[PDB]
Amino acid sequence: GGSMSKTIVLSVGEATRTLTEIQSTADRQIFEEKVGPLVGRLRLTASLRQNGAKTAYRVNLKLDQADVVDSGLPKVRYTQVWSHDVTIVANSTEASRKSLYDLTKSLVATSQVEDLVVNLVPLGR
Amino acid sequence: SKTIVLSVGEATRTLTEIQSTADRQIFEEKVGPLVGRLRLTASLRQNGAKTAYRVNLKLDQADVVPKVRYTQVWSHDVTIVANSTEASRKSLYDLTKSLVATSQVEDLVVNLVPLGR
Question: TM segments (chain B)?
Answer without folding.
Answer: none
